[PDB]
Write a protein that binds this ligand. Sequence first.
Ligand SMILES: *[C@@H]1O[C@H](CO)[C@@H](O)[C@H](O)[C@H]1NC(C)=O
Ligand SMILES: [Cl-]
Ligand SMILES: [Cl-]
Ligand SMILES: [Cl-]
Ligand SMILES: [Cu+2]
Length: 235
Amino acid sequence: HTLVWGVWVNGVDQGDGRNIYIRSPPNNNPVKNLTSPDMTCNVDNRVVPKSVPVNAGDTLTFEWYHNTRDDDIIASSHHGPIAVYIAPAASNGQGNVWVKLFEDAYNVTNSTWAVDRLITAHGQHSVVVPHVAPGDYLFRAEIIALHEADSLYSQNPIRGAQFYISCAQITINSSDDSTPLPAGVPFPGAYTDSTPGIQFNIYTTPATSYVAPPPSVWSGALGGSIAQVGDASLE
Ligand SMILES: *[C@@H]1O[C@H](CO)[C@@H](O)[C@H](O)[C@H]1NC(C)=O
Ligand SMILES: [Cl-]
Ligand SMILES: [Cl-]
Ligand SMILES: [Cl-]
Ligand SMILES: [Cu+2]
């Protein structure tokens, strides 16, 4: 159970984005239904009044929280991977539009899941803004908690992989469009019950065996990291 508070650009806090430049749902409940329109940008997908200006090569940092800003972020039980996707805003995230800019699942050196490192990072994870066409974009940040992912939601709706999905409205101003955005995957649609990484038993299967859901990260990406860029407590 987690939500996005706002974003940072190049290490500078853009301010509370909830229902402003983040298409925020009303609470931190997970999405579980892989076929639901809620997989696109969570349960209250609508245009919000602001879009954060960035340029290609900027660092865009999502900042998550549980109940209050810079708290425990997400329950430690929620081990799983983190991804970020981009699509053009004109799509409203419909169709084959979502391109992967970032993937982190399990780090063998540190023996940590992406979520574990997100807590240590005070909720902060980043991508580098790609050289796509200037214009309006949706950046879709996605945490998958696997603590009940031994079951499939489609079979047992009280269990399943949990998706914490947040869309940010991002305007790319300065870009040479040298890496134009390639075809995307649909959400809902890309993840199915047979997709690697959707059904997994984190209690019996070694984390080193985990494979995150495709698609792979676009070669055009520059992203990106799970790491604290800024100190929310100094505000
Ligand atoms: C899952 O989503 C689909 C598509 O909106 C819907 O038809 C189905 O009823 C949903 N399942 C549950 C259990 O609500
Ligand atoms: Cl609700
Ligand atoms: Cl960190
Ligand atoms: Cl550029
Ligand atoms: Cu939860």
